[PDB]
């Protein structure tokens, strides 16, 4: 029962939520013990490993705090199907292939997802500048025309969250993506990563309406079905999912009667006007700082959401 | 004036500022003609308007901690200098009565900033020269944790200007409240060359 006191002394003290500072100039060891977060990468020695505290079970502790470690999705793709000149923080989309055993998956940037919609019928200049041939992408989806035709394209593409690591292999590329959790880059100088969505595909929804300001403003990706081929739009909102399907129906109110007026839904499966999915949360204050993405030839505008917490969801249909 | 430029320059602020530009243009401009037909109180009016011009100048130069160009007889820093034309110079002397000083001390030679061996190597290879390589070495690779205060880096902001000999410089000095500014007209440098002042 005296070893119980030693075990509870090892178990009790949480990190300090409050600390009475006197001056900021002194920088006491107590406030340093408050503000310090244990790292995730260190050199390969016993001293550096024991100092960073990687070997602690569950969470890092030198020899729980509201932080969750991220999980990484490991994807193998063909080197032709992806452009190695992509930015780091760009959200991708794994397409569920129809073979029983594949080994190689199929992911799509929204730049690459644009040229599946374009052919058969600015942003498109950069998209056709990056990927030269759509036919090397339009066979990854084997039957794209049927799948768009019976409106079952939303349930075959699931989002995967932004990219973090892209090794530059020659035939079969392996990329790493954060499917859930705090998006942070795995680089030895730990640098931040900004989720980049191209500007013409990212229309804001707070300023589209034009007082209670919340913290977590979610980012919604939205597949819709158009007569000009499907479209992949991105919506930032500071509201709930219950709010987001109502306001997205109101936002798509001209487009539904457009698709109805040009084409009568002669069968029963053409009623679905696509679906939406929450890609995760970020801070509503310093969200979506505009920036640019330069290729060798041109440059398109692209939004840069910073400090994204990726959290995918299932597809909620729009009608 | 910080009263208007503190809200954040909306459309209803520049509408005030343009009208105030017009109201200062119709009234307070050409302040050596209203001071002629003022009558008695010309000295108070001119001494007010010069101080209004002086205090409306942002005197937040980063080298203002360097004590240079003091007045010779007093020993107070001469912050500011008027450059006027020669006809208005004696008018400003007589309207302000008399000069508070006859000369000011100052540096006799220019500050010497030549490139050292470390600067030359950075100039040869990369083609990039810093201002004070010894201070960069002193604040990165000699004492990085020793942070810089305004007293500890006042030698570094003064690249030899505070160690240069002091000779008197002949210029008319006046007094505006607390400050002292040197009123000078170098029109005589132009007219013997017939270049447009």
């Amino acid at each position: 029962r005296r070893r119980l006191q030693r075990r509870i002394a090892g178990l009790l003290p949480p990190p300090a939520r409050r600390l009475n500072i006197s001056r900021g100039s002194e920088f006491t060891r107590d406030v340093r013990g408050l503000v310090e977060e244990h790292a995730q990468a260190s050199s390969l020695s016993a001293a550096a490993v024991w100092r960073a505290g990687l070997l602690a079970p569950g969470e890092v502790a030198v020899a729980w705090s509201g932080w969750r470690p991220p999980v990484f999705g490991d994807f193998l793709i063909h080197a032709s199907s992806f452009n190695n000149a992509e930015a780091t923080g760009t959200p991708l989309f794994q397409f569920k292939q129809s073979d029983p055993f594949s080994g190689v998956d199929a992911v799509f940037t929204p730049l690459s997802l644009f040229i599946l919609m374009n052919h058969g019928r600015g942003l498109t200049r950069m998209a056709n500048l990056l990927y030269d041939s759509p036919a090397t992408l339009a066979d990854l989806v084997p039957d794209f025309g049927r799948l768009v035709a019976d409106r079952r394209f939303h349930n075959f593409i699931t989002p995967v969250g932004p990219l973090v690591e892209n090794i530059k292999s020659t035939y079969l590329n392996k990329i790493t993506t954060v499917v859930h959790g705090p998006v942070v880059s795995k680089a030895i100088p730990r640098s931040t990563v900004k989720v980049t969505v191209p500007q013409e595909a990212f229309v804001d929804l707070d300023a589209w309406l034009s007082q209670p300001c919340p913290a977590d403003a979610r980012l919604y990706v939205a597949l819709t079905y158009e007569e000009a081929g499907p479209r992949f739009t991105f919506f930032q909102s500071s509201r709930g999912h219950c709010q987001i399907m109502n306001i997205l129906r109101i936002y798509y109110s001209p487009s539904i009667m457009h698709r109805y007026a040009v084409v009568q839904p002669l069968h029963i499966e053409e009623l679905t006007f696509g679906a939406v999915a929450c890609l995760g949360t970020f801070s509503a204050t310093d969200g979506w700082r505009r920036s640019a993405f330069n290729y060798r030839g041109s440059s398109l505008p692209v939004v840069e959401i910073d400090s994204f917490y990726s959290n995918v969801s299932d597809w909620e249909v729009i009608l | 004036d910080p009263t208007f430029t503190e809200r954040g320059f909306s459309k209803t602020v520049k509408s005030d500022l343009i009208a105030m530009f017009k109201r200062h243009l119709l009234e307070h401009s050409f302040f050596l003609d209203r001071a002629e037909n003022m009558g008695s109180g010309f000295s108070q009016y001119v001494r007010s308007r010069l101080s209004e011009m002086v205090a409306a100048v942002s005197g937040e130069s980063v080298l203002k901690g360097v004590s240079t160009y003091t007045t010779a007889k007093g020993g107070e820093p001469v912050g500011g200098v008027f450059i006027v034309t020669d006809n208005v110079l004696r008018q400003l002397l007589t309207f302000l009565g008399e000069e508070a000083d006859n000369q000011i001390m100052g540096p006799s030679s220019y500050a010497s900033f030549v490139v050292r061996g470390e600067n030359l190597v950075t100039a040869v290879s990369y083609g990039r020269v810093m201002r004070t390589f010894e201070h960069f070495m002193a604040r990165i690779v000699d004492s990085p944790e020793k942070a810089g205060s305004t007293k500890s880096d006042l030698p570094a902001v003064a690249a030899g200007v505070e160690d240069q000999p002091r000779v008197p410089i002949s210029a008319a000095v006046i007094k505006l409240g607390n400050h002292a500014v040197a009123v000078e007209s170098l029109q005589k440098m132009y007219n013997d060359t017939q270049s447009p002042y």
Binding site: - | T3, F4, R7, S10, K11, T12, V13, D16, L26, E27
Partner: protein, 266 residues
């Protein structure tokens, strides 16, 4: 986040701080003519026929300091509008009412069996803004201003609401220190194109003696250009009342120089 608390408490009994006005930076409001339509403030009301309503709405141009209109007969004395008084034609003094009651307050404010507080010899100036059901309160009193568009700042409302007057019927020291510590008397804006009502505290900085005193200071009105151009010329001997025209000297707290050509007046 760096929390900090501090608790202050007064040590003297009476007041210990004064805030005076000292200078005028600029008259930001651009004191000119800009009426606000009652179509923007009362959108739900309209006339019988649709197209006559549309003709009216297109002819007055229904679709900067906000003016208002108090409708008065043409027999209102100009000697009333020369002195700084209340624009509803009744001396709305709250301390010649008693404190913390209602009956003598409503008797002095709206009952006309007693004469005016200022003038012993008449009831009001106009009976169209000083009665209990007149035209002025059917425009501006908040009891009949229900389902109006909030955020417009009818400035004449500060003379006409009852709860402001019943607030002014409290004790005098209570009134002045609750004016000083509670500025939220439904005021105007600070830096806007049109004057809304602010709702946030300790962000904007404004104080009103109009909600304290209920008078207004008359501006330089004139019934011709000739009275303006003769008031600019002579100052001690200008004509206040001409044959059918009239000019009104400004007794405003601010004093503007009136740059007309080169003929100022101060």
């Amino acid at each position: 986040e760096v929390h900090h608390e501090m608790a202050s408490i007064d040590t003297g009994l009476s007041y210990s701080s004064t805030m005076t006005p000292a200078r005028v930076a600029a008259i930001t409001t651009d004191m000119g003519i800009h009426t606000q339509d009652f179509f923007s403030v009362f959108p739900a009301e309209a006339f019988g026929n649709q197209q006559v309503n549309d003709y009216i709405k297109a002819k007055v141009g229904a679709q900067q300091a906000t003016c208002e209109i108090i409708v008065t007969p043409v027999t209102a004395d100009v000697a009333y509008f020369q002195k700084s008084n209340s624009p509803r034609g009744r001396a709305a003094c709250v301390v010649s009412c008693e404190n913390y009651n209602q009956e003598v307050a409503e008797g002095l404010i709206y009952d006309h069996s007693r004469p005016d507080a200022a003038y012993e010899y008449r009831s009001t100036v106009n009976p169209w803004a000083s009665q209990l059901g007149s035209l002025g309160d059917i425009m501006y009193n908040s009891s009949y201003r229900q389902t109006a568009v909030p955020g417009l700042y009818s400035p004449c409302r500060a003379f006409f609401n009852k709860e402001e007057l019943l607030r002014n019927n409290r004790g005098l020291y209570n009134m002045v220190n609750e004016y000083s510590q509670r500025l939220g008397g439904h005021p105007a804006t600070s830096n806007t194109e049109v004057q809304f009502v602010v709702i946030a505290g300790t962000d904007v900085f404004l104080e009103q003696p109009c909600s304290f005193l209920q008078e207004a200071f008359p501006a330089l009105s004139a019934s011709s250009r000739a009275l303006i151009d003769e008031f600019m010329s002579v100052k001690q001997t200008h004509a206040p009342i001409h044959y059918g025209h009239y000019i009104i000297e400004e007794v405003a707290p601010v004093r503007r120089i009136l740059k007309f050509g080169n003929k100022v007046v101060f």
